[PDB]
Amino acid sequence: WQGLMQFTLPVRLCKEIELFHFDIGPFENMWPGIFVYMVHRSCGTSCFELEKLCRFIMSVKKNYRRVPYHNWKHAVTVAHCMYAILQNNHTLFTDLERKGLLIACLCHDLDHRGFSNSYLQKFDHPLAALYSTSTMEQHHFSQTVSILQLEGHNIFSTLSSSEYEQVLEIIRKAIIATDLALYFGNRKQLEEMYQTGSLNLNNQSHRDRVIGLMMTACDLCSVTKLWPVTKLTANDIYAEFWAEGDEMKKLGIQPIPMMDRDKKDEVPQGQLGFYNAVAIPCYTTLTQILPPTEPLLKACRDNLSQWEKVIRGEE
Numbered sequence: 001w002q003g004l005m006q007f008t009l010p011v012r013l014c015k016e017i018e019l020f021h022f023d024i025g026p027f028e029n030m031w032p033g034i035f036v037y038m039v040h041r042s043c044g045t046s047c048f049e050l051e052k053l054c055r056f057i058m059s060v061k062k063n064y065r066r067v068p069y070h071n072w073k074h075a076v077t078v079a080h081c082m083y084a085i086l087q088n089n090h091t092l093f094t095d096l097e098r099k100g101l102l103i104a105c106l107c108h109d110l111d112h113r114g115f116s117n118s119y120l121q122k123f124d125h126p127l128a129a130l131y132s133t134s135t136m137e138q139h140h141f142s143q144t145v146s147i148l149q150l151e152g153h154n155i156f157s158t159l160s161s162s163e164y165e166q167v168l169e170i171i172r173k174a175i176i177a178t179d180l181a182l183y184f185g186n187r188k189q190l191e192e193m194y195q196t197g198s199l200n201l202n203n204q205s206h207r208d209r210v211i212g213l214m215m216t217a218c219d220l221c222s223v224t225k226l227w228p229v230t231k232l233t234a235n236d237i238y239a240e241f242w243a244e245g246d247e248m249k250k251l252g253i254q255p256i257p258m259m260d261r262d263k264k265d266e267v268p269q270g271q272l273g274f275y276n277a278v279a280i281p282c283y284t285t286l287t288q289i290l291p292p293t294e295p296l297l298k299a300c301r302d303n304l305s306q307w308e309k310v311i312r313g314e315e
């Protein structure tokens with residue numbers, strides 16, 4: 001954490017880190033420093049005690065597994081997209097929300113084992129016996145507080161008990177909303193609220209749902225990058241999916257097409273179905289509530305057209 005303290009972002013990156021399409025990929029060693037800068041810009045330069053902030057960040061990095069997808073890179077990618085959402089919609093969210101939301105995005109896949117909630121729930125893994133719904137997401141938030149409770153790690157120690165419980169509730173709700181099983185119902189209710197004109201950001205329940213969709217938009221953001229970036233991320237998503245599907249066939253169950261490596265040919269079509277049914281509706285309703293988030297929708301539409309090109313045999 002000591003080396004992280006002297007870090008300062010190069011001026012060329014300051015301008016590009018504000019953009020939606022921004023790719024963190026070529027700057028591996030700058031990632032912890034990129035998170036510090038984003039926290040200082042959105043929240044404040046002395047928001048947290050720098051020593052504790054840097055202790056927490058590095059401890060979070062250490063608690064991300066050597067998995068192909070749900071690793072340290074994924075968490076920084078999710079945190080960056082959130083920053084760009086918060087920067088373009090600043091006055092709609094409180095200081096406590098902006099700090100909680102950036103922290104939640106960095107902690108959202110903490111201790112992920114490269115396994116879905118569906119696997120754990122059927123093979124009766126202790127986590128499934130501990131949490132029935134949103135299995136991994138409840139474990140991620142469990143690991144978040146367990147990093148905060150370490151010596152010289154509680155970054156929220158300056159806050160009042162009322163603010164500390166509010167921020168932890170903001171983080172719990174945020175990490176839970178990353179369970180894609182919850183997205184479908186959440187987005188439908190918001191689409192109803194928008195069309196009727198009943199949506200009100202001063203209604204705490206409505207606010208939680210909008211924050212929920214922001215969480216999904218960020219967790220899925222790898223579909224809003226440039227085509228060569230998105231393509232290389234799809235390799236990481238599937239390498240993990242297949243490794244899970246490999247364990248499934250060892251136990252005696254047949255894996256789903258997305259989790260079976262002997263089915264790599266269905267990948268462009270599987271991606272197209274995911275874009276039409278999940279990705280595109282997500283960013284469409286996000287652009288409706290938050291119009292400055294429109295570039296996320298455009299980049300996703302660009303990537304759907306690219307999957308449409310691979311399907312037509314013109315790769």
Ligand SMILES: COc1cc(C)c2nc3[nH]nc(C)c3c(CN3CCOCC3)c2c1
Pocket residue numbers: 180219220221222223234237258270271274
């Ligand atoms: C679970 O069902 C699916 C299926 C497919 C085919 C997907 N294809 C994708 N492409 N890009 C993204 C992003 C993405 C996601 C979202 N996932 C969340 C869980 O972790 C892996 C990624 C998918 C999720």
Ligand SMILES: [Mg+2]
Pocket residue numbers: 108109136137178179
């Ligand atoms: Mg997750």
Ligand SMILES: [Zn+2]
Pocket residue numbers: 074078108109178219
């Ligand atoms: Zn995630």
